[PDB]
Amino acid sequence: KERDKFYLSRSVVLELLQALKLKSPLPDTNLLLLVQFICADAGTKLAESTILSKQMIASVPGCGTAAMECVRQYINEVLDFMADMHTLTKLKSHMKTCSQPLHEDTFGGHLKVGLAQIAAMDISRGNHRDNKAVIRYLPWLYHPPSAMQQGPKEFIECVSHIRLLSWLLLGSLTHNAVCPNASSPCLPIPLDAGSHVADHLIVILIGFPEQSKTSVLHMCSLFHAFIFAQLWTVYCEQSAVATNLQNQNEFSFTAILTALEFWSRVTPSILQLMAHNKVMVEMVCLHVISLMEALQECNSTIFVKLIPMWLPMIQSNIKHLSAGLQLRLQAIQNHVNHHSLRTLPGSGQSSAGLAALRKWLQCTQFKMAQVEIQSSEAASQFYPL
Amino acid sequence: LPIQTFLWRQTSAFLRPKLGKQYEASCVSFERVLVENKLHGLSPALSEAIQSISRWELVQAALPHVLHCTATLLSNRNKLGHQDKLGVAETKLLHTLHWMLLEAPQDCNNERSNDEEENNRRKIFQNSMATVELFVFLFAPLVHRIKESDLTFRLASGLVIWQPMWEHRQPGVSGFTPCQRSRYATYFDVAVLRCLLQPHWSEEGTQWSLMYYLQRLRHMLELSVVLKAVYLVLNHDISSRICDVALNIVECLLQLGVVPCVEKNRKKNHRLALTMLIKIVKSLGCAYGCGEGHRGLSGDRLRHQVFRENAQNCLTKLYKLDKMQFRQTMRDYVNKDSLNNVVDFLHALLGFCMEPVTDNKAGFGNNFTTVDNKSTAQNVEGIIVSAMFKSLITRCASTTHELHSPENLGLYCDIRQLVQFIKEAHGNVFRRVALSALLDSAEK
């Protein structure tokens, strides 16, 4: 009987919806342990947390436990939790009933990714071939904000949209790090709409002269969304030579073409703002230098195809950068020239490459927790109403 | 910005999931500004920004744009059908490439002599090592696509670059230019290091790299990253003529003397060659024809010339290097591969599905005392079965619940002969692992 075939995948999730709405009496050692259940259904594990010790998650299996058609109807509270910005300073304003002080800020990232890893599985069954998943709840991916309609309401719409997509990309990146054995191809942002996901950054690009000095969120919008380009690059790396479909090389070719159309739609407005002013060369190429440093950290084959499409155009006015940015640019260029010998994939180097990629994923996910919590806190400082 | 908007428009249409009607309208605007420096018909912002930079800086800004254009056109030329007769626009584009790489050092000192010209070409090729990185990144699968008839005579100025794409000698470009200095990495060595990583290779490009390896060993004797680069083009769909010269190059690479000596380092490069040998012998069919693999004339003639005297000769020369660690390698081969591929490889080597046409006294090694025999162990079949039997028995003993079910029934016939072959032709190691427990707990 159906009430019993999905019985204990329903009794716990009614407290999960009220724990993610932050009203249940439960400690963080037992809060993520409830999300462990909905993650233990498809053979999956969550991200490495520091509020959980190394003796708690050492006895959890990944068996099929009837919790796959109980989260596709409760998938809208995932987008409700990750959609708004204000909940991450509300995490450290309700769960202060434990005496563990060193493990507070990083769970601000660990509860968004703990749902977004779950939202990377039921969407994929909707987004195998036809994409019936995202067109029912949040259809703005196929209907992008266009280039010449950028306003402040459109800015706070589009940066929340790109925060939704970057958190879902972080969830799928945790889903392809510890548990990369899913036969359902994880496609949150499909490449057929890849000509439209490039249009979601043109609003922040040309609107950034006019929508920057209102709050701190407006200022580091270019730091909330140019990590998203790195996440798109590593998602194209994980899905291009992927083992889910019959074709392995031409899918990689059209994934390379989609990544190149995204980069050539996001890059000329960055260079336009570079050519506008020379203090903008510092303020913008801080983000450009940090994203290419993350590209050096990940070492993707999309990055080496864009090495001479940036550096001869950037080094033509290299003397108008700031103090540390010149040293960082020369260090990244010398690491490129050193790693030009070291740009060749094999059969055993990708294991240590993905170990470094998941340690970097945990590090920059803690860094996204710090960036989002600082941005929300000093934006509530800028908006003390 | 202005040249970086015009060429960005001429480049971004090629970098797309679909290619519109601008693939012919872009190569007209490439031999305009670069080949004969015509500035007419286009945007006047390009005419403003061309006279603020040098003639070389236009090449330095335009080379990766039309390089990604040519790479996205040659990767699409396989489907549209211009593999023998080239179009006009791609002819113009390759003429732009051979102007800005070969004829641009000519007029770069004419628009604005051996040592001063060397300093001038060093000033020209200051930041060239990032663009010749992309020159060998965006032509490595595209070597055999441009046929010699497809190579037009408008490209006859650029023969001296592409005729060294088939023999791989030193060409006449300064970005591609005494035993110790060959070990010092020049621009040519780092360029061919940046070249061999691409997929989609075939007979002419692999023969090009292999003739390069032959010329480099002839220059050297008269490092595992190039072994992994050979491995990236020796795990793909391998053919007959390429595995010929590949077995010749592993013959020439085993004799270098960089052998992992485990008997002379205790007082203070091999496994990948073995899996290339295993994939070559497996992919060349079985030695009598029953099983998977390449079937036809080329699959059959290379088991009595190339498996028998280019693969088994390599393994007989490889066994004369070390005597200890080959068992670990073939043990890792057993626990890495499934049942049917091991069946195919050992039918390609032993030939076990047909019965042993011998007599009933195949017991010439069948004693504990006679391990010192070097008849079949110096042959390849005995040493390979000796290094795989001690792990395949532990495999089938850990997988007892997989074989004795009748669903492997026809394959259950195969092993019904196979270990019998190891009973018949290899009774030495059969009797050895038959009573190795006394060597395990009573040789103390």
Numbering used by the authors:
A (entry chain B): 2251 to 2635
B (entry chain A): 20 to 131, 166 to 230, 320 to 364, 653 to 698, 785 to 960
From the paper:
NALCN regulates the resting membrane potential by mediating the Na+ leak current in neurons, and it functions as a channelosome in complex with FAM155A, UNC79, and UNC80. Dysfunction of the NALCN channelosome causes a broad range of neurological and developmental diseases called NALCN channelopathies in humans. Here we report an overall architecture of the human NALCN channelosome.
Local refinement further improves the best cytosolic region containing UNC79 N-half and UNC80 C-half to 3.3 Å, enabling side chain assignment of this region. Despite moderate resolution of other areas, a reliable overall model of the channelosome can be built, facilitated by the NALCN–FAM155A subcomplex structure and the predicted structures of UNC79 and UNC80 by AlphaFold2. UNC79 and UNC80 form a heterodimeric supercoiled assembly that sits beneath NALCN near the voltage-sensing domain II (VSDII) side. The II–III linker of NALCN mediates the association between the NALCN–FAM155A subcomplex and the UNC79–UNC80 assembly. Notably, these interacting segments of II–III linker (Pro638–Arg669, Arg715–Arg737) were unresolved in the previous NALCN–FAM155A subcomplex structure and was only observed when UNC79 and UNC80 were associated. The interacting segments of the II–III linker mainly includes a loop (L1) and two helices (H1 and H2).
